[PDB]
Design an enzyme around this catalytic site. Structure first.
Site: not given
Ligand code: NAP
Ligand code: CO
Ligand code: CO
Length: 374
Positions: A146, A284, A313, A332
């Site tokens: 990705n 991050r 998260q 995210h």
């Protein structure tokens, strides 16, 4: 054997019964020549939602056909979670960065049968590598799967921040025109100085996409790109991040989370940026100090911040990045577009086939193997 696979919940409107489009493009390879995942078969059609609980990454028929068991859950927090209750028995644990099942030293100690931890996505900072090394656990992630998706999200966010898209969209919905309100903070990106922290798979893809915007490109890396690449893209190399950010109108962070990048964009480093700089972070969340970013936006030191990555998260309801001024955040999501899901789901199955057929896992996917860093 038991496979424990942690995924995010389905949409609140249920697992989708339809999609906006009929298919997605076929991706054969990545820039530089790495081939796209090569599983022997897939039990999904690219474009389907794979990373939610009902999606199961397309894995159940394959795994149960071999006599193994698959436990899928979103419940990942604390000792009472399904994840942690099922962990002591699992040979294989799978999760995505977008909804990550953290493998702390403590959990790895309790996971007596654990031998393979797969990151469905890229970036394994949720896995304690020392404990994995100690316990001879293989750690793999789906490299490149990705990286392009994120590079798209980066340029999108840079443009939206600089051109003041979201407040202008809001005037439409509110019934207004308000041209002057929209553009009193709207600039072109053209001829701005833009620098990237890291020129890896995402960072290089960002630089290539920025080049025809006629920006002046900068980068900081431990190792320089070949001079032929620097010349074709007009890159200025900086041997320190401080040196780079001093001259940048826009900074994009594309490095992994590790000791050297933890808390790198703290109050001091952000104070070295140009006043009114724009900061983008889809790397991050913890590379940027949470409260330092809020303060720099409140003071105007940053004109805008955007990214998709947060700490922790999921981000709590009271997380201050939800309400700080001039942001263009998403949850995210960049690495789990439907297009990206197809690739990281195929890659997860490829790894699993290699594991159960006693064939080597691709070297590019390996983070630790046989009790040592790859
Ligand atoms: N959905 C999302 O938002 C999403 C998706 C995928 C990935 N990510 C994040 O983005 C990271 C990068 O992805 P990627 O595909 O580009 O991985 P990559 O191809 O491994 O590139 C990472 C590059 O960061 C370099 N770098 C490392 N430490 C640095 C530092 N302190 N300062 C400047 N550069 C540094 C590394 O160079 P060296 O070889 O010298 O160490 C490497 O070239 C991932 O680790 C992950 O955390 C986010
Ligand atoms: Co090196
Ligand atoms: Co590294």
């Amino acid at each position: 054997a038991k496979i424990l696979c942690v995924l995010y919940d389905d949409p609140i409107t249920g697992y989708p019964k339809s999609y906006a489009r009929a298919d997605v493009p076929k991706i054969d390879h990545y820039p530089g020549g790495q081939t796209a995942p090569t599983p022997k078969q897939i039990d999904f059609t690219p474009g389907e939602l794979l990373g939610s609980v009902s999606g199961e990454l397309g894995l159940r028929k394959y795994l149960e056909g071999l006599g193994h068991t698959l436990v899928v859950t979103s419940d990942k927090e604390g000792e009472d979670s399904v994840f942690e209750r099922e962990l002591p028995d699992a040979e294989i644990v799978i999760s995505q960065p977008f909804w990550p099942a953290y493998l702390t030293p403590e959990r790895i100690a309790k996971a007596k049968k654990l031998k393979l931890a797969v990151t469905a996505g890229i970036g394994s900072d949720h896995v304690d590598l020392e404990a994995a090394i100690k316990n001879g656990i293989t750690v793999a992630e789906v490299t490149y799967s990705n990286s392009i998706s994120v590079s798209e999200h980066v340029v999108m966010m840079i443009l939206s921040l600089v051109r003041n898209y979201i407040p202008s969209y809001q005037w439409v919905i509110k019934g207004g025109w308000n041209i002057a309100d929209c553009v009193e903070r709207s600039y072109d990106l053209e001829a701005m100085h833009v620098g990237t922290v890291a020129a890896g798979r995402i960072g290089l893809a960002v630089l290539k996409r920025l080049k025809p915007f006629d920006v002046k490109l900068h980068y900081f890396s431990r190792h320089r790109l070949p001079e032929s690449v620097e010349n074709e893209l007009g890159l200025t190399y900086h041997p320190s991040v401080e040196d780079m950010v001093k001259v940048c109108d826009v900074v994009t962070i594309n490095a992994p989370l590790h000791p050297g990048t933890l808390d790198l964009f703290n109050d001091e480093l952000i104070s070295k940026m140009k006043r009114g700089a724009y900061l983008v972070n889809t790397a991050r969340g913890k590379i940027c100090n949470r409260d330092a970013v809020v303060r720099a936006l409140e003071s105007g030191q940053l004109a805008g911040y955007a990214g998709d990555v947060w700490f922790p998260q999921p981000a709590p309801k009271d997380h201050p990045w939800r309400t700080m001024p001039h942001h263009g955040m998403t949850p995210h999501i960049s690495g789990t577009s439907l297009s990206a899901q197809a690739r990281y789901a195929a890659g997860t199955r490829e790894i699993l086939e290699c594991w159960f057929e006693e064939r080597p896992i691709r070297e590019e996917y390996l983070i630790v193997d046989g009790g040592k860093l790859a």
